[PDB]
C-alpha cells in the first residue's frame, strides 16, 4: 500500500471508541489536480434524462465489477444517491476533456449513525469506479482524496464504506448467504447445479418457498406510514442497544464538538471486555421521518418495503429488500435491507419477504449475517456464500465486532 498507510484508519499492524484525529482545521482544501486532459464534474443525477446520468449508468454497467455484470438501473441509482440532505458536489465524475468520455466516478451520501454512546452525521462512500482501461494509472486514490475533501468541507470528518478486498483493518466482516427462488433460471444460467444425487425436479421442490403458513396483514408501505415506521425503528434500536437507557437518551452529538480537539475528546470511550457487546447493535443508521419516507418506499424493480398493520392501523412489523438487475440473460437479485419482526418470528417475516421477492420476479435473495439475520439463515435452506464484505470506518475507532453488532447496509 502506497495510499492507505497515510489515512486516519485502523491498520492491519483495541477495545475503545472515538475519533482517530480531531483535525477540524488542518486538512487540505485545494481541489486535487487531475492528469492532463481530465476534469472533474458534479454528476447531474437529479435529472434522470440527463447525459451525466447516461454516462454514469454506462460507466458503472460496463466497469463496476471485480463473466457477469451487475446493472444498476437509473431509477436505482437515483434512489441510492439522491437521498435527503444530499450535496450536489458529493456525486463526483471524471471525464476526458477531448472526448467528454466519463472515465471515473465516486459518491458519498449523508447518513445519521449511532456508534456506541455517540451520534453524528457522517458519510457513506460508494460506487467508486474507474474505466477498465485507466486502471493502474493510480486514479482511484485521487478520487478518494477528492471525495474526502468534499466531505470535510461539509464539516463531516468520518465515513463508512465496504469492500470485498481487505485493505486496512475492518471493524467487521459480513458474509452473504443466498436463498434460491427460481431454480430453472439459475440452473440454465450456470449459477447453480443439480446435485449428482438428485434430479432437477427434486431440486426445484427442495428450494420452493413454503407458502402453507401465511402471515395476514402485510402490505406495501406508503408515504403516510413514515411516522409509524420512524417510531418502529427507534424501538428496534432501543431493544438491541449496547449502551444504557440513559446513554441512549443522551447520546454524545459529535457534530456539536468536532470543531475542537478539546471538546471532541468527549467522544472517547473505553470498553472493559469486547464480549460485553455480544449480540447488541453497536453501530447503525438512524432514520428521521424524511429518511424513512425516502428509503422505506416502493419503487418497481428497485426497493420493496412491506409493513404489517394490526386491526387498529398500527404498524407492528416491517420487511424490506432492494433489487439489482444483473446480466451474465437477465437475473434479478433481491438483497435484504432492514427488517423488524415483532409479532411473528424472524424466519416467518423472511418467509413472507421471500414470497414477495418471488412475486417481484427475483431469482435469488441475498442476506448478510448482519443484525439478527443469523436466526434466519442458520439451519435453513440458505446457502453460505463466498463473498465476504469488509466494513470500514474512516477516522473513528471501533473494536473488531461481530456482524450481528452492525446495522448498516450499503447499496
Binding residues for ligand MYA, rule: CB under 6 A, are: 1-4, 63-66, 123, 125-130, 135-141, 144, 147-148, 151-152, 157-159, 161-163, 167, 394-395
Query: Would you say 149 or 358 has its CB closer to ligand MYA?
Result: 149
Asked if residue 157 belongs to a known ligand binding site, the reply is no
Asked if residue 128 belongs to a known ligand binding site, the reply is yes
E strand or H helix at 218, and its extent? strand 218-220
Asked if residue 251 belongs to a known ligand binding site, the reply is no
Query: Would you say 147 or 357 has its CB closer to ligand MYA?
Result: 147
Do 110 and 123 contact (CB within 8 A), yes or no? Answer: yes
Min. distance of Cβ 148 from ligand MYA in angstroms? Answer: 4
Min. distance of Cβ 129 from ligand MYA in angstroms? Answer: 4
Query: Would you say 110 or 407 has its CB closer to ligand MYA?
Result: 110
Written as nine digits, the cell of 147 is: 471525495
Asked if residue 74 belongs to a known ligand binding site, the reply is no
Min. distance of Cβ 139 from ligand MYA in angstroms? Answer: 4
Asked if residue 321 belongs to a known ligand binding site, the reply is no
Min. distance of Cβ 110 from ligand MYA in angstroms? Answer: 11
Residues forming a β-bridge with 70: 326
Min. distance of Cβ 121 from ligand MYA in angstroms? Answer: 11
Mention every residue, 6+ apart, whose C-beta is less than 8 A from residue 196.
none
Do 403 and 175 contact (CB within 8 A), yes or no? Answer: yes
Asked if residue 130 belongs to a known ligand binding site, the reply is yes
Query: Would you say 25 or 275 has its CB closer to ligand MYA?
Result: 25
Asked if residue 3 belongs to a known ligand binding site, the reply is yes
Asked if residue 142 belongs to a known ligand binding site, the reply is no
Please state the φ and ψ torsions of residue 224, each to the nearest 5 degrees. -75, -10
Residue 77 CA neighbour count, 13 Å, CB half: 27
Do 286 and 237 contact (CB within 8 A), yes or no? Answer: yes
Q: Rounded to whole angstroms, how far apart are CA atoms 408 and 255?
A: 20
Sign of the CA dihedral with 282 first, then 173, 87, and 295 last: negative
Written as nine digits, the cell of 389 is: 464484505
Min. distance of Cβ 165 from ligand MYA in angstroms? Answer: 6
Q: CA separation (Å) from 72 to 109, 229, 272, 293?
A: 17, 27, 43, 22
Do 103 and 38 contact (CB within 8 A), yes or no? Answer: yes
Query: Would you say 24 or 399 has its CB closer to ligand MYA?
Result: 24
- Within 250-330, where are the H helices? 261-264, 289-295
Comparing C-alpha atoms, which of 405, 233, 404, 411 is closest to residue 307?
233
Min. distance of Cβ 241 from ligand MYA in angstroms? Answer: 26
Q: CA separation (Å) from 278 to 180, 391, 407?
A: 31, 18, 14
Query: Would you say 41 or 64 has its CB closer to ligand MYA?
Result: 64
Asked if residue 396 belongs to a known ligand binding site, the reply is no
Query: Would you say 81 or 354 has its CB closer to ligand MYA?
Result: 81
Query: Would you say 4 or 240 has its CB closer to ligand MYA?
Result: 4
- Within 279-338, where are the H helices? 289-295
Residues forming a β-bridge with 94: 40, 104
Q: Which position has the grid cell 456482524?
A: 403
Start-to-end CA span in the chain (Å)? 26
Min. distance of Cβ 339 from ligand MYA in angstroms? Answer: 23
Binding-site positions for tetradecanoyl-CoA read 1-4, 127-128, 130, 136, 138-140, 165
Binding-site positions read 1-4, 127-128, 130, 136, 138-140, 165
Amino acid at each position: 500500500h502506497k495510499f492507505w498507510n497515510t489515512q486516519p484508519v485502523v491498520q492491519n499492524d483495541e477495545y475503545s471508541f472515538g475519533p482517530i484525529e480531531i483535525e477540524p482545521d488542518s486538512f487540505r482544501k485545494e481541489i486535487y489536480k487531475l492528469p492532463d486532459g481530465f476534469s472533474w464534474f458534479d454528476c447531474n443525477l437529479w435529472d434522470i434524462e440527463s447525459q451525466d446520468f447516461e454516462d454514469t449508468y454506462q460507466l458503472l454497467k460496463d466497469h463496476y465489477v471485480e463473466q457477469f455484470r451487475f446493472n444498476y438501473s437509473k431509477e436505482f441509482l437515483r434512489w441510492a444517491l439522491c437521498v435527503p440532505g444530499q450535496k450536489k458536489n458529493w456525486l463526483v465524475g471524471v471525464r476526458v476533456n477531448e472526448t467528454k468520455k466519463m472515465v471515473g466516478f465516486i459518491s458519498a451520501i449523508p447518513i445519521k449513525v449511532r456508534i456506541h454512546n455517540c451520534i453524528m452525521n457522517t458519510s457513506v462512500v460508494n460506487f467508486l469506479c474507474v474505466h477498465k482501461k485507466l486502471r493502474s494509472k493510480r486514479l482511484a486514490p485521487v478520487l478518494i482524496k477528492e471525495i474526502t475533501r468534499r466531505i470535510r468541507c461539509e464539516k463531516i470528518f468520518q465515513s463508512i464504506y465496504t469492500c470485498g478486498k481487505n485493505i486496512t483493518k475492518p471493524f467487521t466482516i459480513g458474509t452473504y448467504w443466498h436463498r434460491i427462488i427460481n431454480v430453472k433460471k439459475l440452473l440454465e444460467a450456470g449459477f447453480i447445479g443439480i446435485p449428482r444425487n438428485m434430479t432437477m425436479s427434486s431440486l426445484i421442490k427442495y428450494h420452493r418457498i413454503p407458502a402453507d403458513k401465511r402471515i395476514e396483514g402485510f402490505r406495501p408501505s406508503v408515504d403516510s406510514d413514515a411516522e409509524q415506521i420512524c417510531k418502529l425503528f427507534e424501538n428496534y434500536f432501543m431493544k438491541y442497544k449496547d449502551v444504557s437507557n440513559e446513554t441512549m437518551n443522551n447520546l454524545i452529538n459529535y457534530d456539536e464538538i468536532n470543531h475542537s480537539a478539546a471538546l471532541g475528546k468527549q467522544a472517547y470511550m473505553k470498553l472493559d471486555k469486547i464480549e460485553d457487546l455480544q449480540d447488541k447493535i453497536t453501530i447503525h443508521q438512524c432514520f428521521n421521518v424524511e429518511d424513512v419516507k425516502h428509503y422505506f418506499t416502493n419503487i418497481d424493480k428497485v426497493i420493496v418495503t412491506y409493513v404489517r398493520e394490526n386491526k387498529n392501523k398500527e404498524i407492528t412489523d416491517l420487511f424490506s429488500f432492494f433489487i439489482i438487475e444483473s446480466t451474465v440473460p437477465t437475473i434479478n437479485i433481491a438483497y435484504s435491507y432492514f427488517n423488524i419482526a415483532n409479532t411473528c418470528s424472524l424466519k416467518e417475516l423472511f418467509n413472507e419477504m421471500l414470497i414477495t421477492a418471488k412475486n417481484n420476479n427475483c431469482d435469488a435473495f441475498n442476506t448478510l449475517d448482519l443484525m439478527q439475520n443469523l436466526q434466519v439463515i442458520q439451519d435453513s435452506k440458505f446457502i453460505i456464500g463466498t463473498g465476504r464484505l469488509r466494513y470500514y470506518v474512516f477516522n473513528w475507532k471501533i473494536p473488531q465486532i461481530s456482524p450481528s453488532n452492525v446495522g448498516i447496509i450499503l447499496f
